[PDB]
């Protein structure tokens, strides 16, 4: 019933500007602040500021004050970021949240955040290579060169769920992503079973099944 | 403007054990500070409000105190679905957070299994070689891995994952991944993964002669 729903996942070249909505629902627009928080990937959160939708009002914290502005509009309920001057720090999930001030302070209701990637790189889907075996055996899959995030990867359909460790991806030189899953299955399995990762790149419309064979 | 310091960065914890965190702040901000809860994939959870005030549908084992510089969240008997990373933030003209605190499992010590994986043949056809360490299922989570060509040491030319605390055994695993042109691959012969860690006697390395 109370919602707060954010644009959807957005790429933008670095020096490029992006402008993230938030339509607000299920509870009255102009008796709330709405903040905006963010979280790079690997970093703490991070607020960028506040803005009363009953005036316009706005409260910027300092490190974003030059190229974050912050707009509403009533008509609509929805509140907008803007973001110039994108770097790739600037890569981030980005948050809108609904929050009281004064007599009492706090933010209670969040929304469920949008992903900004800052890159160069074009869409891309990845390349599977596999990770040969080499009382128990690891196999897997190195999912390589591929752009944006996410990607999923699943083994047997997935049949094989346990002891998988699907890493978290890695950002190459290239500008694009880099990962590998990996199990364990039984040596003795490795004359009778066939071993296939299922990689799913959706932002690229790609599917990839690659055996993994000793 | 008012800086606000967490205590500690990482901290270990078993069910029912009392962990207590701590904020510091560089001036004083009396009453306006919040507690946090955000677990990976998700928007925060708010425990604590005005420094001392429970949010409704929070479990009594939150509590928070302090006033002016120095705050406490503690959780008295601390429930599984309570590991996760823990923010205070300052509700007071900016609303800067904290560093975050982490709150993990504590378990028994495992050493790694270590597995090296050289490049696949499909791969050499593109010109690219990647050669991927495993460390599997290790506790604590503080390992090094180590890449030798030819026994001279490698650094600063690899790339490395870690996983977070696994689900059922609560272990790590981590993945490194020494990436070279096939050019630069075939001119060698020894790759090579050395991984000290403390639940191993000695250092461990896996290795592999390329044309064997």
């Known amino acids: 019933e109370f919602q707060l729903v954010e644009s959807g996942a957005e790429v933008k070249k670095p020096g490029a500007s992006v402008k993230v909505s938030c339509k607000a629902s299920?509870?009255?627009?102009?008796?709330?602040?709405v903040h905006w928080v963010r979280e790079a990937p690997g970093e703490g959160l991070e607020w960028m500021g506040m803005?009363?939708?009953?005036?316009?009002?706005?409260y910027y914290a300092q490190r974003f004050q030059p190229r974050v502005t912050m707009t509403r509009d009533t008509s609509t309920t929805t509140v907008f970021m803007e973001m110039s001057g994108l770097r790739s720090e600037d890569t981030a999930v980005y948050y809108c949240?609904?929050?009281?001030?004064?007599?009492?302070?706090?933010?209670?209701?969040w929304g469920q955040g949008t992903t900004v990637t800052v890159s160069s790189a074009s869409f891309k889907g990845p390349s599977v290579f596999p990770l040969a075996p080499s009382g128990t055996a690891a196999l897997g899959c190195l999912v390589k060169d591929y752009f944006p995030e996410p990607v999923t990867v699943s083994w047997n359909s997935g049949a094989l769920t346990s002891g998988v460790h699907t890493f978290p991806a890695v950002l190459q030189s290239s500008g694009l992503y880099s990962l590998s899953s990996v199990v364990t299955v039984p040596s003795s399995s490795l004359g009778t079973q066939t071993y296939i990762c299922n990689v799913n790149h959706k932002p690229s419309n790609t599917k990839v099944d690659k055996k993994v064979e000793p | 403007d008012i800086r606000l310091t967490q205590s500690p960065s990482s901290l270990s914890a078993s069910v029912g054990d009392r962990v207590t965190i701590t904020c510091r702040a560089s001036?004083?901000?009396?009453?306006?500070l919040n507690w946090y809860q955000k677990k990976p994939g998700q928007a925060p959870k708010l425990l604590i409000y005005?420094?001392?005030s429970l949010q409704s549908g929070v479990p009594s084992r939150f509590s928070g105190s302090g006033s002016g510089t120095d705050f406490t969240l503690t959780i008295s008997s601390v429930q599984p679905e309570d590991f996760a990373t823990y923010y205070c933030?300052?509700?007071?003209?900016?609303?800067?957070f904290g560093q975050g605190t982490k709150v993990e499992i504590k378990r028994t010590a495992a050493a790694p299994s270590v597995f090296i994986f050289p490049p696949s043949d499909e791969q050499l056809k593109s010109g690219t070689a990647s050669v991927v360490c495993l460390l599997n299922n290790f506790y604590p989570r503080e390992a090094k891995v180590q890449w030798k060509v030819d026994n001279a040491l490698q650094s600063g030319n690899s790339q490395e994952s870690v996983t977070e605390q696994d689900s059922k055994d609560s272990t790590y695993s981590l993945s490194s991944t020494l990436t070279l042109s096939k050019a630069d691959y075939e001119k060698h012969k020894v790759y090579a993964c050395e991984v000290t860690h403390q639940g191993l006697s000695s250092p461990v390395t896996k290795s592999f002669n390329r044309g064997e």
């Open positions: 005005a420094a001392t």
């Open positions: 933030q300052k509700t007071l003209r900016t609303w800067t």
């Open positions: 299920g509870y009255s627009f102009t008796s709330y602040y």
């Open positions: 001036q004083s901000i009396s009453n306006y």
């Open positions: 803005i009363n939708p009953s005036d316009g009002s706005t």
């Open positions: 949240a609904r929050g009281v001030v004064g007599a009492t302070n706090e933010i209670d209701f």
